Amino acid sequence: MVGLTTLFWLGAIGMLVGTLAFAWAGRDAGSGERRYYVTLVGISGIAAVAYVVMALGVGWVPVAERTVFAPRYIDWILTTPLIVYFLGLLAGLDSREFGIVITLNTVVMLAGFAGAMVPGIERYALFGMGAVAFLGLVYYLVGPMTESASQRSSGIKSLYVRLRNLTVILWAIYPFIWLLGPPGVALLTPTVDVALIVYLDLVTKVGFGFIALDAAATL
Ligand SMILES: CC(C)CCC[C@@H](C)CCC[C@@H](C)CCC[C@@H](C)CCOC[C@@H](CO)OCC[C@H](C)CCC[C@H](C)CCC[C@H](C)CCCC(C)C
Ligand SMILES: CCCCCCCCCCCCCCCCCCCC
Ligand SMILES: CCCCCCCCCCCCCCCCCCCC
Ligand SMILES: CCCCCCCCO[C@@H]1O[C@H](CO)[C@@H](O)[C@H](O)[C@H]1O
């Protein structure tokens, strides 16, 4: 229990550091720019709360012979569409296309959560639904959204592509962790699972936010 608790506290601290840095960076509150900072504060702030809750030993749900971390999935349901929103803003995406990518994202996270909570082998059908919706989300990120980003200045398009790449490459690792970890075949221990996810969560949220902060200043 000590290892898992320690990892969750590390996640909480890293998320808190991001949250404070984004809130501070955003204080200037430029009318067009404010939205981006508030969104980053929401992304890392919600994650911080989730990690604190888990560190305190809340929401460790036993499912068959594994443990499900409910706050992790609730976190993702809330924070991943905020990341997609940030990317859609950057890309200058149209309202229909925003709706589509937010829908596909929500399918991924709901299917992953539901799958984690189903004891039997039918849970892999839920994983599959999420994997299919994720391929759709990736298509949008690398296709239509990238085309949309090209209507922006070269610097904004470069930022879009940088954050798009970070997002696509790291998000693609999560389903493999689900499959190899406790929700799937339970090869990886809960500690190894949590350690990998803490890194990935930190980089996809904080380590995404700092890249945007850097580009925003350099712009
Ligand atoms: C906008 C809405 C339409 C979307 C709402 C999200 C919704 C879709 C989530 C669906 C799942 C929902 C049905 C939950 C059911 C889970 C339940 C079956 C699990 C069993 O319950 C286990 C409990 C305690 O043991 O864990 C319980 C887990 C914890 C109690 C919850 C974990 C906390 C969250 C991860 C953090 C939430 C964010 C903060 C409330 C806001 C922080 C703001 C920030 C800026 C400081
Ligand atoms: C300006 C730099 C600020 C960076 C934001 C993150 C703050 C550091 C918080 C500690 C992070 C813990 C490291 C966990 C890594 C993933 C699990 C590794 C276990 C081997
Ligand atoms: C482009 C592909 C990248 C290579 C990654 C390899 C694929 C990862 C395999 C994940 C699912 C395989 C399930 C078999 C795991 C072994 C079962 C052990 C039981 C505890
Ligand atoms: C959920 C899985 C979805 C699979 C990804 C295929 C979606 C892309 O499919 C494409 O959509 C375009 C809209 O931008 C259309 O113009 C194209 O005709 C169509 O091929």
Side-chain angles (χ1 to χ4, degrees), residues 3-26 28-33 35-93 95-96 98-146 148-219:
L4 290 173
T5 302
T6 298
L7 291 166
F8 292 140
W9 280 121
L10 288 171
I13 285 156
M15 293 300 182
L16 284 177
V17 171
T19 306
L20 299 170
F22 308 146
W24 189 264
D28 58 348
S31 180
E33 276 204 357
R35 201 168 312 121
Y36 291 97
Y37 292 94
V38 177
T39 300
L40 287 176
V41 172
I43 289 157
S44 59
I46 295 170
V49 167
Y51 273 104
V52 170
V53 163
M54 292 188 287
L56 292 166
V58 178
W60 300 22
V61 184
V63 178
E65 301 285 354
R66 69 232 195 215
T67 299
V68 175
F69 301 109
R72 158 191 297 179
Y73 299 103
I74 294 160
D75 167 349
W76 297 351
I77 288 159
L78 297 173
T79 59
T80 61
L82 289 177
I83 295 163
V84 170
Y85 173 67
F86 190 105
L87 293 171
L89 277 185
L90 201 52
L93 199 60
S95 186
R96 174 184 199 191
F98 247 125
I100 289 160
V101 295
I102 293 294
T103 298
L104 287 171
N105 185 85
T106 302
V107 174
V108 175
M109 306 301 159
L110 291 184
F113 187 19
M117 296 296 290
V118 173
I121 62 180
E122 71 278 19
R123 75 191 180 276
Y124 288 105
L126 283 164
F127 171 84
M129 177 80 275
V132 165
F134 181 71
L135 295 174
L137 176 62
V138 169
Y139 162 77
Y140 273 89
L141 287 163
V142 303
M145 294 183 56
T146 294
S148 182
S150 298
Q151 321 302 165
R152 301 278 227 148
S153 62
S154 57
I156 291 298
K157 164 79 178 307
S158 288
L159 179 56
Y160 172 78
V161 164
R162 182 172 315 121
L163 293 177
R164 174 203 79 174
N165 290 350
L166 181 76
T167 295
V168 165
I169 288 161
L170 300 181
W171 286 35
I173 301 176
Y174 286 80
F176 290 91
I177 309 304
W178 192 102
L179 283 176
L180 290 176
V185 304
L187 174 60
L188 306 177
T189 59
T191 307
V192 168
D193 180 76
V194 168
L196 295 174
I197 292 305
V198 165
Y199 174 80
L200 286 164
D201 282 357
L202 286 170
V203 175
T204 54
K205 294 191 168 69
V206 182
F208 178 106
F210 275 108
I211 291 167
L213 259 53
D214 174 61
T218 114
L219 284 172

